[PDB]
Enzyme design. Structure first.
Site, PDB file in Angstrom:
ATOM      1  NE  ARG A 240      -3.446  -2.456   2.551  1.00  0.00           N
ATOM      2  CZ  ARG A 240      -4.627  -2.678   3.105  1.00  0.00           C
ATOM      3  NH1 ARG A 240      -5.453  -1.669   3.330  1.00  0.00           N
ATOM      4  NH2 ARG A 240      -4.986  -3.909   3.429  1.00  0.00           N
ATOM      5  CB  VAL A 241       4.256   2.221   0.676  1.00  0.00           C
ATOM      6  CG1 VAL A 241       5.199   3.362   0.392  1.00  0.00           C
ATOM      7  CG2 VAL A 241       3.845   2.230   2.132  1.00  0.00           C
TER       8      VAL A 241
END
Ligand code: ATP
Ligand code: MG
Lengths: 119, 40, 50, 121, 221, 57, 50, 240, 121, 100
Positions: free
Chosen positions: J26-27
């Protein structure tokens, strides 16, 4: 009495009945079969026609393609890669196809043309 | 890109037996012209 | 040939007349539907008024 | 209790024969429905007719229907049922039309319903 | 909780004539999860009520709206709650729909099907198109009788399946404008007599010769 | 030559007579489908502008 | 109910309890609201038996 | 999450069951049609066979398609398979018989040359690195006599010549609707077997123009009608 | 508000057609996975190609996902969406590969990515 | 995020056994260098789409040219991400590999 005609295509019994006279054209000229006749085997011409003549009807005319002829004691027997009656030949495509350069299809065309009365 | 393409040219990049025994020759059907004239 | 030539125009005029009849019936029930629909319009209007 | 030790041997044999015929008919029913009865074989056509006759003779004129038809209800002894279905499976009623099997009692009712339809034996 | 729901639903009754003849018709609504009709409260209320209308998401997405599964939906009262007209035009419907549902596997091999099989397939497709209905547009009983008469009487076999809906609507529209007497007979007599059937059939024939399909062709037999 | 012309005129007469015979029903169905399309464009223009009458009222 | 599927296949009588059962967003509220709306003509008749 | 998974698996298996039952009934209809075609093509084959033997009775049996070529170096095998693949061990049995034939040919110094009819044979033989001389597709379910004529013309032209010494066909013989057997046939050069006399004081046949030319013009027609009958039997067997 | 009275007749018709196509595809997926796509009809193969193109054209390169795909985002008006999916359901792009529908915006992006793969529309 | 490892992918030879479809970070590109951010731009989506396509076309008899090209590119990208245990790669060599 009369003779028995049995025209069988390669995949379907084209026609079968009794007949008074059977005209066709071998590679050695025309020929007409009558109720009794010597046993004979003969290859029909490229664009052969076969005119069967029955007692109480009109003379059926059949364009035969790839046929052979075998006359015996019982009756005539014609083989045929493809047979087309007089009542079904389209004069337009038949005539147009006659002048093709392909031998087989031109022979088919000439047969279809003879069967319907023209040529 | 050109180093890769010049390496690619220097890179060094039969019917199986099936071990099936022979059919019996008696099983190989023979199309025959059955002549009915005796001249063997 | 003569009888076919006359039958052609006979069927032609028959088709013309019957098709005119059918399109007339259509132009009739068309305004019928228009009547019904404007009636529904005004009754819906008065409903919203009330 | 559908067991030779309880119902006997003839009862069990007739019941198994009827069940076999009916199961085969139910197997053929899908071919009959989708592709048509005409495509079937002739042994299959015979079995289908016999099975339809058996399946219809399984019906009965119930005593609960008397209030609607007036016909008294039937009470077929088990021996007569065994005999009737044995004779059905054999084929003794392969010529009788189907409508002669709907809602009848034993064998005499069947014979009378058939004779009243222009068909005997 | 079964008591909670059965105590409530057993008060929807049809009283005697000695009590006035009143009635209370109950329509409970149950939301299953993932079509789990075997859950606890669905089981209870299915056991309590007189019949069930099973609405499905798959049918809803296929354009079948109302998405009622006519295969598993049941009514234990039955034809006793139908007028004679609807009782006779809809008796030829359940078997036709079942035959269509069992033949729809051969929808792509109609060439290999018997003539009766293909006829049943096409009639079933038309019937499935007949039971569709817009939302917030309920039909009186005589118009439903006429629609199901269209369906089961064979008068939709000439119409393309992608036009049936429209055809039905338009025909009813015609009958609401020109021949109101047919609908009045069905509404007041609760039955479709032979004279009314003949009148309706000839009206259908005229409308068919006046109808215009979407494929261009005519819908006349 | 004119006997040949006679038989040719006979064949052509029968041919184009059958042709006109078929063209009769051809133009018949053409007229009727034209009438149908006209009739269905009618009453549907009416449905449309009537819906517009209700939406403006 | 005014719905062809129900009125034809699963009829509802006056005194019956019919369950409308379905997952969600399948049209249960819609079926019941249509059943309610269909009684408008019954209401306009003024007959307490209808 | 296994319960949603199991319900979905049940739904998918039900779909598969419906599809396969439909396919079985369709195959029943089509085997009826294929048997019809076979028994309608039988009579012409019978008649050409009896005409060919009548010709051979009084012929000079020296035609290339009738003589055993010394030092056989190659053999042309035509393997008849299907296009659609929902059949059982049909193509598997065909390939087993063709492998047995290839071994029989290698045990006689003959390199087998491979002609195929159908896509499943193409798959089986391209996966095994065979070089296929010529392929035919699209008519393994409803073969017409034109396909047989073309195939047999290619085969006899390969025989009379890059060139083969004999021709075999591996195809499925259909019988009794419960047993379809893969078979290897040797279609050329034909074996001459002198069966009987049959007729002694028999009315002699007249030949036009002559017996030998008729015989050499009829032999390829006999071979191609044999190939046609083979294609029909293979189609019926595939549907069964 | 997916109602013909709110979003209009064409919006609603296109949405219902997309939903029907995707439902038919979800129903065929298991057959295609087990028996292969060549077992379907020609109608069904046509619908499966359309459904795959449609389910790929519903995806989009969002503005907030540039951090995950490096690609800038797109915006498509509702009328362009309606007409594009109308053309998809009618079959105007059944010759464009399955890619060139994947993570794009409107019809201009579709043309760009289709020509990037050697195709037109 | 999550790096979901599977036993099926482990036995098939895919090692590390990461399920590329359901694994995610999710980064994202913020946790990469510029070179790896550009070369490995849409690698996860390409490989998810490749796995979907091969599952769909497992039994197709004839595919298009774009479908075949995608299947070949996906097979190569799968074979490229396999790596033995305790054999790390510097970030420049990984950049070169994903550029290949
Ligand atoms: N017959 C119909 N035709 C077309 N659309 C319909 C029909 N019935 C319902 N719908 C649509 O379905 C949508 C939701 O249906 P509805 O709300 O009635 O389902 P529900 O059973 O109430 O589900 P929930 O209670 O979970 O909301 C509505 O937006 C409506 O437009
Ligand atoms: Mg609700």
């Amino acid at each position: 009495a009369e003779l028995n005609v049995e025209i069988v295509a390669v995949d379907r019994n084209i026609w079968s009945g009794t007949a008074k006279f059977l005209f066709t054209r071998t590679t050695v000229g025309e020929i007409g079969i009558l109720p009794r006749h010597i046993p004979l085997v003969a290859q029909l011409v490229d664009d052969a026609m076969v005119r069967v003549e029955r007692e109480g009807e009109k003379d059926l005319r059949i364009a035969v393609d790839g046929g052979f002829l075998s006359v015996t004691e019982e009756g005539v027997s014609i083989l045929a890669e493809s047979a087309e009656f007089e009542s079904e030949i389209d004069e337009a495509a038949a005539k147009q196809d006659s002048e093709s350069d392909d031998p087989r299809i031109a022979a088919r065309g000439r047969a279809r043309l003879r069967a319907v009365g023209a040529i | 890109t050109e180093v890769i393409k010049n390496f690619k040219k220097g890179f060094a990049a039969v019917v199986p037996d099936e071990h099936v025994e022979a059919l019996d020759e008696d099983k190989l059907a023979k199309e025959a012209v059955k002549v009915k004239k005796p001249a063997p | 040939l003569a009888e076919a030539s006359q039958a052609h125009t006979k069927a032609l005029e028959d088709a013309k007349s019957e098709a005119h009849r059918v399109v007339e019936e259509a132009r009739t029930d068309a305004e019928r539907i228009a009547e019904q629909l404007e009636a529904q319009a005004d009754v819906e209007a008065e409903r919203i008024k009330m | 209790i559908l067991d030779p030790s309880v119902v006997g041997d003839e009862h069990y044999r007739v019941a198994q024969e009827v069940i076999r015929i009916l199961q085969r008919y139910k197997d053929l029913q899908d071919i009959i429905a989708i592709l048509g009865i005409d495509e079937l074989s002739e042994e299959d056509k015979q079995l289908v007719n016999r099975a339809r006759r058996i399946e219809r003779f399984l019906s009965q004129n119930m005593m609960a229907a008397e209030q609607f038809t007036g016909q008294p209800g039937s009470t077929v002894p088990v021996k007569e049922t065994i005999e009737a279905f044995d004779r059905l499976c054999k084929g003794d009623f392969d010529h009788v039309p189907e409508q002669a099997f709907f809602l009848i009692g034993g064998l005499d009712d069947l014979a009378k319903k058939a004779e009243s339809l222009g068909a005997k034996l | 909780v079964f008591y909670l729901h059965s105590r409530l639903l057993e008060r929807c009754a049809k009283l005697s004539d000695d009590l006035g003849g009143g009635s209370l018709t109950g329509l409970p609504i149950i939301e299953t999860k993932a079509n789990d009709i075997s859950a606890y409260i669905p089981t209870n209320v299915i056991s309590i009520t007189d019949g069930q209308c099973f609405l499905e998401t798959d049918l809803f997405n296929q354009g079948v709206r109302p998405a009622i599964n006519v295969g598993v939906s049941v009514s234990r009262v039955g034809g006793a709650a139908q007028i004679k007209a609807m009782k006779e035009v809809a008796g030829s419907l359940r078997l036709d729909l079942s035959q269509y549902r069992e033949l729809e596997a051969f929808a792509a091999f109609a060439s290999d099907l018997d003539a009766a099989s293909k006829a049943q397939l096409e009639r079933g497709a038309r019937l499935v198109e007949l039971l569709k209905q817009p939302q917030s547009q309920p039909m009186p009983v005589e118009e439903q009788v006429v629609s199901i008469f269209l369906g089961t009487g064979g008068h939709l076999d000439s119409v393309p399946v992608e036009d049936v809906r429209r055809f039905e609507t338009e025909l009813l529209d015609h009958m609401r404008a020109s021949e109101e007497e047919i609908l009045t007979e069905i509404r007041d007599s609760q039955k479709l007599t032979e004279e009314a059937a003949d009148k309706l059939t000839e009206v259908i024939k005229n409308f068919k010769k006046g109808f215009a399909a979407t494929g261009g062709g005519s819908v006349v037999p | 030559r004119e006997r040949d012309a006679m038989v040719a005129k006979t064949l052509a007469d029968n041919k184009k007579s059958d042709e006109q015979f078929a063209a009769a029903q051809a133009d018949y169905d053409e007229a009727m489908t034209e009438a149908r399309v006209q009739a269905s464009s009618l009453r549907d223009n009416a449905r449309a502008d009537g819906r517009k009458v209700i939406e403006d009222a | 109910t005014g719905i062809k599927a129900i009125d034809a296949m699963t009829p509802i009588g006056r005194g019956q309890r019919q369950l409308i059962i379905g997952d969600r967003k399948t049209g249960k509220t819609a079926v019941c609201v249509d059943t309610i709306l269909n009684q408008r003509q019954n209401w306009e008749s003024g007959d307490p038996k209808k | 999450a296994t319960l949603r998974e199991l319900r979905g698996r049940i739904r998918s298996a039900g779909s598969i069951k419906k599809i396969t039952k439909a396919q079985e009934l369709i195959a029943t209809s089509r085997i009826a049609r294929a048997q019809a075609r076979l028994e309608s093509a039988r009579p012409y084959a019978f008649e050409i066979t009896r005409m060919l033997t009548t010709l051979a009775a009084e012929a000079a049996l020296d035609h290339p398609l009738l003589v055993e070529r010394p030092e056989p170096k190659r053999a042309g095998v035509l393997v008849v398979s299907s296009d659609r693949g929902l059949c059982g061990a049909y193509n598997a049995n065909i390939f087993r018989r063709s492998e047995e034939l290839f071994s029989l040919l290698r045990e006689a110094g003959k390199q087998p040359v491979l002609y195929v009819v159908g896509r499943k044979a193409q798959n089986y033989y391209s996966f095994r690195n065979w070089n296929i001389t010529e392929s035919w597709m699209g008519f393994s379910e409803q073969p017409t006599y034109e396909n047989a004529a073309e195939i047999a013309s290619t085969l006899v032209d390969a025989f009379l010549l890059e060139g083969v010494d004999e021709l075999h066909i591996v195809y499925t013989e259909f019988k009794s609707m419960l047993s379809q057997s893969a078979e290897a046939h040797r279609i050329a050069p034909m074996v001459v077997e002198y069966v009987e006399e049959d007729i002694g004081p028999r009315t002699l046949y007249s030949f036009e123009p002559d017996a030998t030319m008729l015989f050499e013009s009829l032999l390829p027609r006999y071979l191609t009608t044999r190939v046609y009958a083979a294609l029909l039997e293979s189609a019926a067997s595939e549907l069964a």
